[PDB]
Each structure stands twice: as C-alpha cells, then as structure tokens.
C-alpha cells in the first residue's frame with residue numbers, strides 16, 4: 196500500500212480549519228489509514244474554508 200491523496204469540498208457551507216481537519220481524519224480512519232498531512236482549500240469569509248486536500252497513509 197502507498198498513501199492515497201484525497202480532495203473534499205462543499206459548495207453549501209464555509210467551515211473552520213477544525214471542521215476540515217476532523218473530516219480528513221475521519222475519512223482516513225474509515226479507510227483503515229492514518230491522516231499524515233492536509234491543506235485547506237478555497238478560503239472563505241475571514242477564517243473559514245470550503246474544502247480540504249489530504250493524504251492518508253497505511254497504519
């Protein structure tokens with residue numbers, strides 16, 4: 196297994212870093228992997244974002 200790069204965004208809500216980190220973490224965990232890195236996408240408002248791109252790696 197290698198690590199997998201994944202991209203998620205929403206067109207209906209802007210959310211904080213914490214929400215997107217949570218989404219990335221839980222996505223990797225559902226795939227039996229661990230989140231290694233991530234970066235926010237599509238900054239919104241003064242402190243929010245509309246997506247995240249992240250890398251899930253083998254346990």
Ligand SMILES: [Cu+]
Nearest residue numbers: 212213216217
């Ligand atoms: Cu974070």
